[PDB]
Symmetry: D4
Subunit: 160 residues, 8 copies
């Protein structure tokens, strides 16, 4: 069926991180698309992607980028849809540049930001799912089952 979440990232090297978002949406049976869109090298591609997202039926955009990470913020500038941002870990500054470049958006143009790295990618997918679950009772039930299994699966003591 048509995608309701869009996962976008600046480059192939981002995929090692963003694949965890993709996996989780697939696990929760959320139809989505996964694309490369680079804010600095393909800025017109980004403009077109973001401003047509709503009319294309997307409900949430998950965007990942590292370094001077402008992809989530510029996506949000062109869409009214909620945009979730994943800071990709950078080589020198370990994602601190990614984090600050994404989370520190000015008032008026939001990006809901998740943790640096794979955890943030997973949680962007989960946050997107909790948003969609507000209107989709079947997904809401799957998400509840997922959260309940997570809780039940935590062991009671460590292995030495």
């Amino acid at each position: 069926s048509a995608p309701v979440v869009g996962i976008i990232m600046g480059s192939q090297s981002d995929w090692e991180t963003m694949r965890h978002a993709d996996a989780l949406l697939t696990e929760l049976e959320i139809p989505h698309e996964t694309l490369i869109v680079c804010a600095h090298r393909t800025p017109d591609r980004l403009a077109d992607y973001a401003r047509t997202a709503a009319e294309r039926g997307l409900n949430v955009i998950i965007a990942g980028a590292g370094g001077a990470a402008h992809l989530p913020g510029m996506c949000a500038a062109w869409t009214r849809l909620p945009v979730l941002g994943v800071p990709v870990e950078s080589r020198a500054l370990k994602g601190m540049d990614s984090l600050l470049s994404i989370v520190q958006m000015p008032g008026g143009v939001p990006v809901g930001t998740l943790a640096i790295g794979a955890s943030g990618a997973k949680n962007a997918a989960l946050l997107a799912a909790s948003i969609l679950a507000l209107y989709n009772p079947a997904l809401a039930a799957r998400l509840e089952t997922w959260r309940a299994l997570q809780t039940a699966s935590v062991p009671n003591s460590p292995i030495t």
Copy 2:
């Protein structure tokens, strides 16, 4: 009308920041409740608030805290609703402690984090609006008007 967004904050001192979220929801005519809930000083109040949020009809929770800011994360631990986190600027570390203790959530329990301070409070309310707009056409139109006015009102040159 029954609140569909809950704004919670750790203390009265957070209100200077979180009032910007409250004002924005009011401007967009989003029914909401605005409460003090402290993860450390009132942990049972928090548990009850978060675990009953969904059955009370809340759709999104906005949570603001500073320092070792645990309020958004522990709220997300007890609800399947989307939780948006606002790092409140702390005295010594200028909200960097607030930011890291909110954004760096483990995979499995997300918090959509906004900028440190008033800007983040305003954006949490806007992000909450964009989530609700997915399934409220009248609100989607008002949000569209809000973003259009923001864009159109930016001056073309500085005043000296």
Copy 3:
């Protein structure tokens, strides 16, 4: 005999760090328990653990967590017992997120925080021992012997 110290951690991956606390309590013949309790994935488990700790005869809780590290702080919210916090080293931010998330507790709910990593785990055990030694003369004598041996064992010059 019944445990007087509880060592808790969010996950198996924390054990590589927290095992040093366990080893030291065993060395000093301090009866203890070692458990996994995750603040975000098992928040009700945490609530029950912390609020029954005193009646179960625990005297000190040592809690380790990394990233948005909320386990020590939320433990302290539910118990009047002293809670000692160990920041576990995180991948991207090297435990700085862990450290700030733990040490920056608001006035009214304390967590005595130790160094990032294995050193902090060892010192949490030693700090717990110095607390217990205030009422336990045999342990006080063992601790004094331990500190004295540490001092006597420092070499006078390096090996080239």
Copy 4:
């Protein structure tokens, strides 16, 4: 009555912060002494203070310092009593130098570290109280009352 807690600080300028520890111990009626002891300017005063603390009847030492804050760590070097460290906010680096120079102790000589500033001073006194409460039933009851009042006094909504 003879002091069971010693509060020491590097200088008069630290008092603005450490007075919060003094006030809390007084509120809980914990006999204590409040002194200036500087690791760098009065190192022999420090050596004598710390090495005689236990035989003088002290149970816990609370030590506050800023900058290259060596007072808590060197105090712990000379006593087997639990030492709690308060990072005082420094002018330039806002207590980040204070924090790192206190919390990052080597394994073998612990300092239980609290938050930067007044909050950390208050919490050091509370942590000291929770330690003493383990073997003083009357004090344990007063601490229970203190925490219960803290929890109950948190307002339910912000004042505008």
Copy 5:
């Protein structure tokens, strides 16, 4: 005369900083335009400004922004002209977010970044002048005079 340098900034609040660039270009008699252009609130205004800059006769663009400062980078995405970036000091993080989000550009789309604040604004105008001076002899002479006066005017001893 037609502008050969464009100074753009995200908002009126940036003017306190960017006015130093404007004053310097005026002092050196470099024809320029000074405009407000916001990457997030006016992204289409930015796209148009940057993509037409060269055909409008601009030679250098100076762009100032704070927080998640995306203005210089997105400007460079759409022009082949040299873009110089001025990190504006932000309230919470003192321009460290501004700095990292401007300087850490991916290979392929450069931004020549100057210091945080007024100094960086002044230097962006001076750097723009040194670029134009390469092919404007009269301006090169005025810049030489400017640097010579700067050097010669430094006092030999402090005034008390």
Copy 6:
């Protein structure tokens, strides 16, 4: 033909980073020279290099250094030419010392600073090319072709 760009660096160990600047100038057929000049070990060599650069026909200087990185700044003190600075990644502080040592120049003596590491070296070359392209139509055409190919070469989706 005679060099119009000078690439300088403090040591052989900088070459692993600065070679990317060299490669890009060669790709764009920009005549250049590549030298070692160390601000601290050969300060008179630096003084002579920088103050004769313009008369030798250089148009732009690209300077790379790490740690207490003073080579770009001191180069700029002695020339009126535009100086572009590349922070070389340092072992302990990952180039943060390099970055701050270079970008934070006082008003009056500019250094256009690029990203930490290989990306910054590549972009210094590209920034130098965009400066030269202002007066050199053939190079301007090559640069435009280069930017256009960069944009066209970005893939549309990632490889799993």
Copy 7:
């Protein structure tokens, strides 16, 4: 008497900090000179000052600067005298840029670095005194008196 210590600083604004070095040398009756020398705006003045320091009879140089603080390091490049560096507190980054750009010198050209701000200025003068005291018995006695008075004058308890 001829100066044996040179105090140099980048600008008049540094004097608020460096006056503490000047006052201390005067108190200890160490003949000195106090001058403005800026690495970036007056690089030839710096070269001449540093290379002639030893033949002019100077024994120690104290150098203060903020931001990209290159003054101490470039001074050490041109003299074999010990150079002591004072990081002056900068507006945005609170002297962290000053600190890193001074302390992180390459092996081969040392700068003995003191604390950010007035404390570092005072300590640079004291460190210079302790160096001169090695071969001036009268000064060694005055320094001994100074340190003894410092130690003895520390109060025993805070004033409320």
Copy 8:
């Protein structure tokens, strides 16, 4: 002959760094001693070492430590001799805790601080040599020869 420089460090693991100081003193034929002295585990050893250093004929102390690095500062508290501090690189925080713990000494008790790691150890030795060279003409000549060879040995271009 009797040692005139003392190199001290907290542990064997510091030797990997401090060996570079030792090597350089030996190269310059400066008689020295090299010892382990740990501020926290052997505080009385430190007190005795530092307060007898001058009467034992030492002229300069070089002290290295990592983490909460108190060895240089506490050494300086007990001696009037110049004390040079080397921040040893720490595992989690890469020596930033070491650096701040050492350099941020309060006014009145100086530590001349060098770079994090091997470079700082080498430069502590060189700084110690420049201090001793003020009174020792033969060493002064060796140091000048050493500095001159360093300068002459810098290559003119990199190897590809």
